[PDB]
Amino acid sequence: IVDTCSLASPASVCRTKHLHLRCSVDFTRRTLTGTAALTVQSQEDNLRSLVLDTKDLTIEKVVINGQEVKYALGERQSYKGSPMEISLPIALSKNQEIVIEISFETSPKSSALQWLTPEQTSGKEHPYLFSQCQAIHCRAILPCQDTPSVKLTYTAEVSVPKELVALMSAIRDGETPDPEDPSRKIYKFIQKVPIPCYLIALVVGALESRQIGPRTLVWSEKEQVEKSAYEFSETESMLKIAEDLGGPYVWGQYDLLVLPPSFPYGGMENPCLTFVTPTLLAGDKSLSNVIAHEISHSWTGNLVTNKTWDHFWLNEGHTVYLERHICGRLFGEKFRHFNALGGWGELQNSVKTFGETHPFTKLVVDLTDIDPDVAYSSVPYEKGFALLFYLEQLLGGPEIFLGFLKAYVEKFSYKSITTDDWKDFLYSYFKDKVDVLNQVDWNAWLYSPGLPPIKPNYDMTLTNACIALSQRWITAKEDDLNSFNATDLKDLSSHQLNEFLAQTLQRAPLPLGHIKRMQEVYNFNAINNSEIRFRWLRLCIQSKWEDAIPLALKMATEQGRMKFTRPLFKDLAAFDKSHDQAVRTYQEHKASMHPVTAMLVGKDLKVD
Ligand SMILES: Nc1nc(-c2ccc(Cc3ccccc3)cc2)cs1
Ligand SMILES: O=C(CCC(=O)N1CCC[C@H]1C(=O)O)[C@@H]1CCCN1
Ligand SMILES: [Yb+3]
Ligand SMILES: [Yb+3]
Ligand SMILES: [Zn+2]
């Protein structure tokens, strides 16, 4: 097993046990400056040097046992960054530990970070910083073994402008004035559970908090706090169900932080402090599956971890599985099946997009010379979910399968594993059903591109109305348009309306008169739910309605969640009437976008 995304010494050579980070956030220079003290344990006899990951870091010195030591930065290897070799002052025996203190400064163009000016924030008076380390961006903040095969604890002390607040993926451990500068404050943090370094996270801004359950505060700028608190009020209930399914929650606190609109993801499962998009703020709790997902990662991903990024489906497929069980416990089994079948839809769309032979449609991927950000998609989520949901049905149902899941989490808690570790444990647990397991086409499911070789069984109860209405619009001729009316939607939930649009978007384009009639009768232009609006606006642009152009450009640029921004820009580039405006809008906004999203939209548009 090789981590082909890391340049560092592997876990077979040495392992980081602990990080003590001391740093200062400088908004004038857009740099984090500090010292990273790594406690490293040798796994070999006679260890005399090691190699760390870095990306666009300035190294001031390396100190061991109170003296400076020699080190060298290797040449840059594109998105992997530059290997940093450190010469140890004394040779280590196996299991010996030493502390290496590295003084460093980040680049303003750090791939991990977005720096926001006051005008980019809600409140308009203070700047803002946030990090996004997954997959391999920790190395763009601090030198490390930037591989999920290594887990460490951490403590940190962060100096900020005293008007601001810092938070991390860790338990808050107090705040004091910075004794070396009275315009600044030092915020302290402790992470006592070992974690892969991708889970390190930092935010600095004008943040306020509100308590929403016994172990949860929501944090955001003042303007978003009230709405956040209502939107995520199911959090404690979801935590209780997740503890039922996965075992104890070991992390102490489960806080939420609602980021600025440019956050690239729906959520990031940073331990103690999940980060979420403000595009979840629909006003009705309807997008709370994203919370159920991130909660679930407190078991699958954060406790049991993929050993390399080629086995990312372990993290994500299992988390989707748990997510859908949480939402199933809250709203019913028929709803679990509705969401499962929607996810198969998403998988169809991914596979169609990539093409059925594309190597990024395999469940287990080979990321040798591939930037993980470029590979990222819903495939590991939904092909991974599909595998588990197939297996559930093959092995005697959800209760039985959930017994496996809990046992799996107990077995591999605090470790990092591969697909073969998972499959061996599946065969062991289900030793009395090996004959059923040997019916699975494991080679196709794990290692072949395209749609999986078997589709699970799905209850259709809540899906049927969606399909029916979609088919009415698809088969409608001009003389049928008058028959449609706002009453068509009266018995559809918001999740059903979203699925009606998803079904219809799969058949897009529709005739432009159909799309005009849909606005006339349903007033989808008025709906602010981000999922619904995204789909509706894709429908409109693919169906070549020029009126939708400014609406889609607005949604593409006023938020940055990659799931919405990337396909809106690609649709707008594909419509000749909006093509030049899409490229120009991207160019104008690029410097103020998140660095990952900017890179990806530029790739998508063939721009730069
Ligand atoms: N089609 C498939 N893709 C993957 C996969 C996709 C992306 C990654 C890397 C990654 C993981 C998480 C955030 C950004 C990048 C690793 C694996 C796994 S199965
Ligand atoms: O799984 C999650 C969150 C999932 C996420 O943000 N998704 C899923 C596909 C679309 C995107 C989104 O919801 O915007 C993170 C990504 C880094 C690792 N865990
Ligand atoms: Yb020795
Ligand atoms: Yb007709
Ligand atoms: Zn996830």
Rounded Cα distance, 337 and 459, in Å: 6
Rounded Cα distance, 272 and 192, in Å: 11
CA-nearest of 207, 297, 188, 193 to 246 is: 297
Does residue 427 have an active-site annotation? no
CA-nearest of 337, 598, 325, 287 to 460 is: 337
Residue 599 in contact with residue 567, Cβ under 8 Å? no
Q: Which helix (H) or strand (E) holds 334?
A: helix 333-354
Q: Which two tokens stand for residue 532?
A: 């619904």
Rounded Cα distance, 588 and 586, in Å: 5
- Is 327 exposed, middle or buried, given 0-12, 13-18 or 19+ CB atoms closer than 10 A? buried
Residue 582: which residues within 8 A CB-CB, separation 6 or more? 553, 556, 569, 572, 573, 605
Rounded Cα distance, 330 and 592, in Å: 40
Rounded Cα distance, 293 and 316, in Å: 9
Residue 195 DSSP symbol:
E
Indicate if the alpha-carbon torsion angle 103, 108, 113, 115 is positive or negative.
positive
221, 294, 382, 499: which one is catalytic? Answer: 294
CA-nearest of 263, 270, 25, 268 to 170 is: 270
Rounded Cα distance, 321 and 326, in Å: 9
Phi then psi dihedrals of residue 93, to 5 deg: -85, 170
Sequence ranges of the binding site: 132-134, 264-269, 293, 297, 316, 561-563
Q: Which ligand is nearest to the CA of 534?
A: 2
Residue 270 DSSP symbol:
-
Rounded Cα distance, 234 and 138, in Å: 31
Task: Report CA 210 to chain centroid distance, whole Å.
Answer: 24
CA-nearest of 50, 51, 86, 92 to 71 is: 86
CA-nearest of 253, 207, 214, 208 to 233 is: 214
Residue 114: which residues within 8 A CB-CB, separation 6 or more? 129, 130, 132, 262, 594, 595
Indicate if the alpha-carbon torsion angle 479, 482, 486, 487 is positive or negative.
negative
Rounded Cα distance, 484 and 270, in Å: 46
Question: Ligand 1, atom 11: nearest CA belongs to which residue?
Answer: 135
In the chain, what are the domains?
Answer: 13-205 (2.60.40.1730), 206-302 (3.30.2010.30), 303-459 (1.10.390.10), 460-608 (1.25.40.320)
DSSP string, 482-535: GG--GGGGTT--HHHHHHHHHHHHTTPPPPHHHHHHHHHHH-GGG---HHHHHH
Provide the resolution (angstroms): 1.6
CA of 63 to the centre of ligand 3 (A): 24
Beta pairing partners, 416: 305
Rounded Cα distance, 445 and 452, in Å: 6
Indicate if the alpha-carbon torsion angle 283, 284, 287, 288 is positive or negative.
positive
Q: Which helix (H) or strand (E) holds 372?
A: helix 372-375
DSSP string, 282-306: -SSSTTTHHHHHHHHTTTBTTTEEE
DSSP string, 535-575: HHHHHHHHTT-TTHHHHHHHHHHH---HHHHHHHHHHHHHS
Residue 379 in contact with residue 350, Cβ under 8 Å? yes
501 Ramachandran zone, left/alpha/beta (phi>0; psi -120 to 50): alpha
CA-nearest of 312, 460, 456, 309 to 387 is: 456
Q: Which of 263, 265, 315, 563 to mutate to test the pocket of ligand 2 (most atoms within 8 A of CB)?
A: 265
Rounded Cα distance, 23 and 49, in Å: 25
| Ligand 1 close to Cβ of residue 134 (< 6 A) | yes
Rounded Cα distance, 335 and 325, in Å: 10
254, 381, 522, 586: which one is catalytic? Answer: 381
| Ligand 1 close to Cβ of residue 360 (< 6 A) | yes
CA of 5 to the centre of ligand 1 (A): 12
| Ligand 1 close to Cβ of residue 263 (< 6 A) | no
Look at residue 391 and give its three-state secondary structure: helix
Residue 204 in contact with residue 31, Cβ under 8 Å? no
Rounded Cα distance, 134 and 288, in Å: 22
Does residue 294 have an active-site annotation? yes
Which atom in ligand 2 lies closest to the alpha carbon of residue 297?
A: 19
Look at residue 320 and give its three-state secondary structure: helix
Residue 355 in contact with residue 390, Cβ under 8 Å? no
Q: Which ligand is nearest to the CA of 95?
A: 3
Residue 595: which residues within 8 A CB-CB, separation 6 or more? 109, 110, 111, 113, 114
CA of 472 to the centre of ligand 4 (A): 12
Question: Ligand 2, atom 15: nearest CA belongs to which residue?
Answer: 268
DSSP string, 117-164: -GGGSSSSSS-EEEE--TTTTGGGTS-B--STT-EEEEEEEEEEETTS
Which atom in ligand 2 lies closest to the alpha carbon of residue 277?
A: 14
